[PDB]
Amino acid sequence: QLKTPKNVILLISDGAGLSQISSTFYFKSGTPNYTQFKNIGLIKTSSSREDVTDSASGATAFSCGIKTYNAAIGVADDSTAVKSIVEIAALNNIKTGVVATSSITDATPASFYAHALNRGLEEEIAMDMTESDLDFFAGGGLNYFTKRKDKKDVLAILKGNQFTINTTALTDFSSIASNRKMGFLLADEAMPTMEKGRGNFLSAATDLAIQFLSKDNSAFFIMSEGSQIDWGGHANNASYLISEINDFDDAIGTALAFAKKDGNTLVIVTSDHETGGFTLAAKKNKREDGSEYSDYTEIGPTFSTGGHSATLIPVFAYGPGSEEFIGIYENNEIFHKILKVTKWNQ
C-alpha cells in the first residue's frame, strides 16, 4: 500500500536518454536535481508499429495509456480517439496545465490536449485547444492561432472560453491570479533556445502553472516539457543539447522544491525516447602522423545518428505513490500507474 498523491507533475525531456541525463553530471554547475530521486524505473518506448518511436506516439503512450502508430496524437492504433489524462483529470475535478519550450502545438504537448490523425496537422491541433478542458498553457506557437490557412482568429475563440491570453511575456503570479484560465503564447513558432537567451522560462512557467492551478486548493495535473533537448540531438549539436537539458534539470528542481514542501505531490520525470546516440566519449586528439587518439581525462561528446533510438529510458519519481514507478515496463504504463496512485477514475 503506497500513498495517494493529490497533485501530479509530469516533466518530459524530449529525446533524453541516460547519456543525455548524464551530461548534467559533468557540464552543469553544481549537483544535478536528478540526484534527489530514489525511485527509478525504466520504460520501453517502441510504438504499436515501429521499433523506434517518434514524439507523437511516445507522448500519446503517456497521455492516453496505449501503444499507437508513429505520428498519432491522442488516437489509438486503429485511429479511434482515446481519452487523455487531461480529460480524465477534468472529469475528476482536477485542474490541468501544459508547458513546453516548443510550439504548444508540437507533438508532446498536443498529445495531452488534442486528438489528430497526424502530428503535422498543427493548425487543427491549435483549434483542438478550444474544445479542451485545459486550464493553463505556456509555450510558443502563436502562428498556429493567428496566421492560419483558414484565416480564423483562434485567440478570440479561446477568450470566449474564459482564457486570458498573453502574447508578450511571462508575468508575475499577481498578474494572472484572478483569471479563470490562462494561456501564454510567447513566440511565433518555437521559444528561443537557451543559447539565444530563453533564460528561466521553463522553471518560471512551471511555477506559475503550479500557483495558478492550485488556487483555492484544487488538485492539479501539469505536464512540462524540455522540448528542445531532442532538437540538439537531431542536429548533433552538443552545446545545444547540453544547455537545454541543464535548463530541464533546473525545472526538475523547481518541481521538487514545491513537492517536498507541499507533501502531497507526485513528480515523475521521464523522456519519450533518446536521440542522436549522444555519447560522453573520451576527448579525441590528433597526432601529426596518424591523427586520432583518446584522452580519458576529459569528455568529448559524440553522436552516431541524426534520428531517434530505441534504448530503454529512465523514469524518476518522487512523492506519494512514487514506488509504483520502479521496475521495467512499457511506456504506456506510465498512464495506468498515474491513474492507479491518484485514484482518478473513469
Residue closer to a second copy, measured from CB, 52 or 235 = 52
Residue closer to Zn ion, measured from CB, 7 or 20 = 20
- Number of Cα atoms under 13 Å in the Cβ half of residue 181: 20
Q: Who's near 23: CB < 8 A, 6+ residues apart? A: 241, 242, 245, 246, 278, 280, 301
Q: Name the one range near Zn ion by CB under 5 A: 223-231, 256-264, 291-299, 331-339.
A: 223-231
Q: Does 297 bind a second copy (CB under 8 A)?
A: yes
Least separation in angstroms between CB 63 and Zn ion:
12
Phi then psi for residue 232, to 5 deg, are -60, -40
Q: How crowded is residue 91: how many other Cβ atoms within 10 Å of its Cβ?
A: 12
Q: Does 230 bind Zn ion (CB under 5 A)?
A: yes
Q: Does 39 bind a second copy (CB under 8 A)?
A: yes
Task: Using CB under 8 A, pick the residue from 5, 17, 226, 232 that binds a second copy.
Answer: 17
User: Footprint of a second copy on residues 231-290 (CB under 8 A)?
Assistant: 274, 277, 279-282
- The SS3 call for residue 11 is strand
Residue closer to a second copy, measured from CB, 161 or 302 = 302
Residue type, 251: A
Q: Write out the DSSP string of 222-274.
A: EEEEETTHHHHHHTT-HHHHHHHHHHHHHHHHHHHHHHHHHSSEEEEEEES-E
Q: Pairing relation of β-strands 7-13 and 95-103?
A: unpaired
Least separation in angstroms between CB 313 and a second copy:
8
CB–CB of 75/118 below 8 Å? no
Residue closer to a second copy, measured from CB, 48 or 132 = 48
Task: Using CB under 5 A, pick the residue from 272, 274, 324, 333 that binds Zn ion.
Answer: 272
DSSP class of residue 21 equals H
Sketch the per residue contact string, 302 through 341, with a second copy: x for CB under 8 A, - otherwise.
xxxxxxxxxxx-x-----------xxx-------------
Q: Which residues are catalytic?
A: 55
Q: How crowded is residue 81: how many other Cβ atoms within 10 Å of its Cβ?
A: 15
Q: Name the one range near a second copy by CB under 8 A: 3-11, 14-22, 114-122, 169-177.
A: 14-22
Least separation in angstroms between CB 54 and Zn ion:
7
- Residue 236, by phi and psi: left (phi above 0), alpha (psi -120 to 50) or beta? left
Residue closer to Zn ion, measured from CB, 10 or 341 = 10
User: Footprint of Zn ion on residues 108-137 (CB under 5 A)?
Assistant: 108
Edge-to-edge strand list for the sheet holding 220-226: 163-166, 181-185, 136-140, 95-103, 220-226, 7-13, 265-271, 313-318, 39-44, 327-330
Count of residues touching a second copy (by CB under 8 A): 49
Q: Alpha carbon of 132 to those of 1, 136, 211, 253, 272: distances in Å? A: 34, 11, 21, 29, 23
Count of residues touching Zn ion (by CB under 5 A): 6
Binding residues for a second copy, rule: CB under 8 A, are: 17-19, 21-22, 25-26, 34-35, 37-42, 44, 49-54, 70, 274, 277, 279-282, 294, 296-299, 302-312, 314, 326-328
Residues forming contacts to Zn ion in the complex (CB under 5 A) are: 14, 55, 108, 227, 230, 272
